[PDB]
Structure 1
Amino acid sequence: KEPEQLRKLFIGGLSFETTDESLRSHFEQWGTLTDCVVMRDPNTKRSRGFGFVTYATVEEVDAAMNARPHKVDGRVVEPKRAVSREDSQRPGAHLTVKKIFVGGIKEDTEEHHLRDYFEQYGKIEVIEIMTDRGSGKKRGFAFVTFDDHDSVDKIVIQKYHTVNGHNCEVRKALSKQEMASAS
């Protein structure tokens, strides 16, 4: 079977009136849910405005994501691949971004190498293999931009990515200022 983490979706922006039952009624349209829950304030019992839905298979998760936009209880919500508690500790881990930072790529890496691995996740809009300003030397990293934030999410929730024959690290791209705030 597939790991519970990859079979789960974070549902943000829920109407304060959405309950486990109404959330389930909506999302069961795309598959068998093994878990469905609205997070609430431990004390006031009030809804925190987000919940989680888990399907029996990742294929059903993909169907749900392909069904966006989603409107639950009259409110447009935002379904996202669930980022593990461990990974949610990283700065910007929950940001909606369309660009990924690809690190540790060999110096002879070319755009076709990046496409052969990344296109499977979604439409690529931009690819930029970074080089040094002045020497023209390859720097060992690149940026890839997609047309859907879910393409980036589907990627970053995975541990390994093979480009030009070897593994490379992939993370959501952070702005110059985001980088500065994180360190």
Structure 2
Amino acid sequence: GAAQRQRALAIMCRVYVGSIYYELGEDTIRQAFAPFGPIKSIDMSWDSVTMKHKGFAFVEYEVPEAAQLALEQMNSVMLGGRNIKVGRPSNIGQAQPIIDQLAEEARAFNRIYVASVHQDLSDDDIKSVFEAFGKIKSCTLARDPTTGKHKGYGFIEYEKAQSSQDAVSSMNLFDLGGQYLRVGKAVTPPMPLLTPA
């Protein structure tokens, strides 16, 4: 129940990155994938006998919506003078029925994911901006546990689905601060580890 959902959520947070220029490093990948959400980890291939990575890496995000946006955007983009391949891990299958269940459950909500939120922007002023598409039920930015500094992303929940669709359409890649917002619909319901019979 709650255990197999956690297993799929963990796979949903990871994105495969292939065709990485041999001279490119972990920081180049970090800067490139950080706009979609804060990076939890970068697992990179290493050929001990040949030196330098084996052209691919696994970027792990904190939330599955970040991985979905980094997949939609970022695939085929040029990095270091080589077009990268962005996909999902090979074992994403035989986990897919739960990924599809989480997607069905997400459709019951009018929740959107927002990344690349400028550090100086707060909760209420992000709420005021996105309130242009309709009445907002909740608007919350993710915070750092130590300092109350937000992590550059959050979730907005709308009363109507039209508002939700309008917001993603009109606000993805919007110039708010020096940063371009990355906005997508949620791919999970709020708190996916619930399964309430």
| TM-based fold match above 0.5 | no
TM-score grouping bracket, smaller chain normalisation: 0.3 to 0.5
**Pair member with larger Rg:** 1
- State the TM-score, normalized to the length of structure 1: 0.44
- State the TM-score, normalized to the length of structure 2: 0.41
